Every structure is written in structure tokens, then in C-alpha cells.
Ligand SMILES: C[n+]1cn([C@@H]2O[C@H](COP(=O)(O)OP(=O)(O)OP(=O)(O)O)[C@@H](O)[C@H]2O)c2nc(N)[nH]c(=O)c21
């Protein structure tokens with residue numbers, strides 16, 4: 334009977350790389366949820382009925398935030414980016430992505446989870462990517478707290494840093510090695 338409210342409401346987005354297009358016109362809102370039961374119903378189903386493919390990306394964002402730099406909650410923000418080796422086991426990708434989602438819907442960064450906008454997985458033959466997007470790239474204390482807890486929660490090796498990129502820098506990159514406002 335009684336569903337267990339997620340403290341907050343969430344939307345899953347899909348993106349299939351059409352690039353003739355306007356980037357934003359390729360998003361797709363898949364469905365929304367705000368209970369523990371509906372999260373797992375969606376996660377279980379999407380995993381079994383989907384297939385990993387290059388260019389086909391997924392985003393989970395708080396209700397009302399579109400997963401794009403242009404959104405008001407994202408324009409001043411940035412992301413903690415995890416870049417996977419080409420060589421990683423699919424098992425790693427699965428675990429990292431679910432652990433990321435659980436950090437989102439479980440509000441794992443305590444008072445700083447209010448800075449969290451969503452998370453994105455990019456499926457790329459060059460190397461898969463997972464990131465948590467936050468709303469203000471100049472909030473050093475919130476951004477660095479989120480980064481540290483996130484890196485630990487995924488059990489990443491302490492010797493390799495992960496980087497926080499501002500969306501403003503990402504969009505204007507040229508080397509296509511975007512610089513990191515912060516590392517952890
Ligand atoms: C997240 N994002 C990505 N793009 C565009 O999609 C392209 C691919 O951005 P990408 O995030 O898909 O990285 P990819 O691994 O495919 O390549 P990378 O650029 O070397 O990191 C980018 O060059 C952007 O032009 C975006 N374009 C807009 N307008 N808004 C966005 O929020 C946005």
C-alpha cells in the first residue's frame with residue numbers, strides 16, 4: 334500500500350546522438366518518479382530492456398531541471414566527472430552508475446545534496462563517462478564535499494584524482510581537455 338516517498342522527485346532522460354540537429358532537441362524525458370518503489374521499478378526494467386550503445390546517454394535530474402547547461406540550475410554549475418578506462422569491465426560501469434543514482438535519490442551528501450542537479454552517463458567507445466552535475470561551480474565547500482564523498486562512495490583508487498569542470502569551461506573548450514576547477 335504505502336509507497337516510501339523519496340524525500341524528492343526525479344526525471345529520467347534519454348539522449349540519442351543526432352548531431353545534424355540542435356543538441357537540446359535530442360533529449361527525451363522517459364518518466365518521472367518520487368518513491369523508492371518506482372525508482373527500483375524503473376531501474377530494474379530499463380536495465381533488462383535496454384542495450385548499451387555509443388552515443389546513447391541517460392540522465393537523472395531533479396524535477397524541473399533539464400539535463401543541459403542552458404537550464405537555469407545548470408548554467409552557473411559544473412560536474413564531477415568520472416572517466417572510465419576503455420578497458421573497464423561492464424560490471425564496473427553498472428556498479429558506478431547505480432551507486433551514482435543511489436547517491437542522488439538517497440541525498441547522500443547531507444546538506445550539500447541541495448546543490449546536486451542530476452547525473453549523466455555517456456556511453457562512448459573512447460571511454461564511458463559518469464558525472465554528477467551541481468548548480469554552482471563557485472561553491473567551493475559544497476563542490477569539494479560532494480566530490481570527496483562521491484569518490485569514496487564509488488570506491489575509486491585514492492591515487493587517481495577525479496576532476497570538477499565548470500559547465501562554462503566545458504562549453505568553450507578547445508584542447509578538448511577541459512580544465513578542472515577542483516580535483517579530489
Ligand atoms: C552536455 N552537452 C553536450 N553538448 C554538445 O555535445 C558534444 C559532445 O559532448 P558530450 O558530453 O556528449 O561529450 P563527448 O564524449 O561526446 O565529446 P567531448 O566533447 O570530447 O567531451 C559537445 O561538444 C556539445 O557540443 C551540449 N550542448 C548544449 N547546447 N548543451 C549541453 O548541455 C551539452
Ligand SMILES: O=C(O)/C(Cc1ccccc1[N+](=O)[O-])=N/Nc1nc(-c2ccc(-c3ccccc3)cc2)cs1
Nearest residue numbers: 345375376379380381382383384385386391393427434
Ligand atoms: O547488454 C546490455 O548492454 C544491457 C542489458 C542488461 C541486461 C541484463 C542484465 C544487465 C544488463 N546490463 O546492461 O548490465 N544494457 N542495459 C542498460 N541499461 C541502461 C540503463 C540506463 C538508465 C537507467 C536508469 C534507470 C532508472 C533511473 C535512472 C537510470 C538504468 C539502466 C543503459 S544500457
